[PDB]
Ligand binder design. Structure first.
Ligand SMILES: CC(=O)N1CCN(CC(=O)Nc2cnccc2C)CC1
Ligand SMILES: CC(=O)N1CCN(CC(=O)Nc2cnccc2C)CC1
Lengths: 304, 304
């Protein structure tokens, strides 16, 4: 028992972190096989930042300008290329610590762990969700670019995010490992609109199931609702509309607790309409949406 | 910017996790140099659990009864001994992945990361605080015993906790790495009183400084208070009394923000007396006490 905002063990990803320096800029790189991936803005200077011409800036750079260091060992760069907003630096040595891995583009509302790094050195690990508006609310300071987000399925690391920027609002934006930004963001120091965000309804329901499993039950009521009725409340409270696909993903949790998904929706409806009345659920005084139904099942069964 | 409940990178500790089986019971062990540490209750059976005579139960066991497996490799046990509530199994091979390490007994109110493990395999990592009453509110299922808590100072891992039990209240208890329980707990399946707990005042203040640094400032007011006055409020709201030692530890945060510690106390006093009024601080709707002043400084400066 107990429910915590748990991150994946970061060991397999720590073994891939390197430092990348180009000119005066230092950030993090991800060394997998004989390739180091890093944000392309490592080639920018302070003036360039406002509207960089990345193709022109990269043409001024040669393999020897990319200084890549894995702790104490220096890597020899034998190729460089830009793919979307990432640079791929081919090195002459395959990372001996390369885990089994995949590059995946996650969906908004899915969760992942972030290994925050500075100068190629890991500082901490935390779990977070890709917001419906494609931003993440992380903890990143200057030098954290190139830190990655990932999930782990037994021995396979699926990298889903590489950190690129902090928007003027203090929220974070980045790319998949092919350098495509999540959301409308660009790697420029410009004010950029993040879409209207919503709360991830399916995750809040999953977390209400985690609460019941772990003994927090005060919010269960004598009511039920329909998807239509619930979605009118979700609309008023800026929650994602619930679909049958979300109900289907909550199936295992519904089966385990014996609480029908629409009955849990009626509990969530009453919490949205009345608040928590100064009470808590799993140590939180708000409705948590950073746990997917998969996360809840995994934590509640002890998956390694 | 951004502030997250960050755990230490778990790689150095993942490399130490092993599985220990004695009879029908399997739990986790910590392999450091040529010693494997694990909870002594690995030698109990269902009947024994209520009041085990550990000295007698261990006398029935020989080195060959302790099956220790590090992933796929089997370790050869050449000695066994009980120290307080831990067993130390001497093995014939020093762990090649042994990091620089220390065994420390943490103080109540201090924080640490837990690497939750099942069958010697890491499942996740989360940060938590040792409650003032010496319990932890973790996420542990059957098989998680032997999972450890730790802090990391650059390359040195200070192990401070080994998980032993879940109290009937769903809270967790364990020992330091010398097998001494934190708090009054014993390794028996008996109802056990956990002391009256309090909120870690110095940590809530540290977290209010983290909030101001990261832009959440709505709670700052035109008031000040004294340690005496603040401590009358702390008393009413079951917060730890604030001392000059706590004020001194908040010094760096006070210097960085320019907000005197007693002025932050007056903000905390108003939040205790009036609540959050449906607002949030760093994504939380309650007063968070799981970040020490050290944690706040480290996260706000990017320490690796
Ligand atoms: C070079 C360029 O066009 N830019 C504009 C500056 N950015 C730098 C940037 O966003 N850093 C950063 C990331 N995360 C947290 C904190 C900070 C300070 C990179 C992309
Ligand atoms: C052998 C003995 O005297 N006991 C009594 C049983 N306990 C087992 C125990 O507390 N397990 C556990 C730990 N954490 C979360 C969930 C569970 C189920 C070990 C100590």
């Amino acid at each position: 028992s107990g429910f915590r905002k748990m991150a994946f063990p970061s060991g397999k990803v720590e073994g891939c972190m390197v430092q990348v320096t180009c000119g005066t800029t230092t950030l993090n790189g991800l060394w997998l096989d004989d390739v180091v991936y890093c944000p392309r803005h490592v080639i920018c200077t302070s003036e360039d930042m406002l509207n960089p011409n990345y193709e022109d800036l990269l043409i001024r750079k040669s393999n020897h300008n990319f200084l890549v260091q894995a702790g104490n060992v220096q890597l020899r760069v034998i190729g460089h290329s830009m793919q979307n907003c990432v640079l791929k630096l081919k090195v002459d040595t395959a990372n001996p610590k390369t885990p089994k891995y995949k590059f995946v583009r996650i969906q908004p509302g899915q969760t992942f762990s972030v290994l925050a790094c500075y100068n190629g050195s890991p500082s901490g690990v935390y779990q977070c969700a890709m917001r419906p508006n494609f931003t993440i609310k992380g903890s990143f300071l200057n030098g954290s670019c190139g830190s990655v987000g990932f999930n782990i399925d037994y021995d396979c690391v699926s990298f889903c995010y590489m950190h690129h920027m902090e928007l003027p609002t203090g929220v974070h934006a980045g790319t998949d490992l092919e350098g495509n930004f999540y959301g409308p963001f660009v790697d420029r120091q410009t004010a950029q609109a993040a879409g209207t965000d919503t709360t991830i309804t399916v995750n809040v329901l999953a977390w209400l199931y985690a609460a019941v499993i772990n003994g927090d039950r005060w919010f269960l009521n004598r009511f039920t609702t329909t998807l239509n009725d619930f979605n009118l409340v979700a609309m008023k409270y800026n929650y994602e509309p619930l679909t049958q696909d979300h109900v289907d993903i909550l199936g295992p949790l519904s089966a385990q607790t014996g609480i029908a998904v629409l009955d849990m929706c009626a509990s969530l409806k009453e919490l949205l309409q009345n608040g928590m009345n100064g009470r808590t659920i799993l140590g939180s005084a708000l409705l948590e949406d950073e746990f997917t139904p998969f996360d809840v099942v995994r934590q509640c069964s002890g998956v390694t």
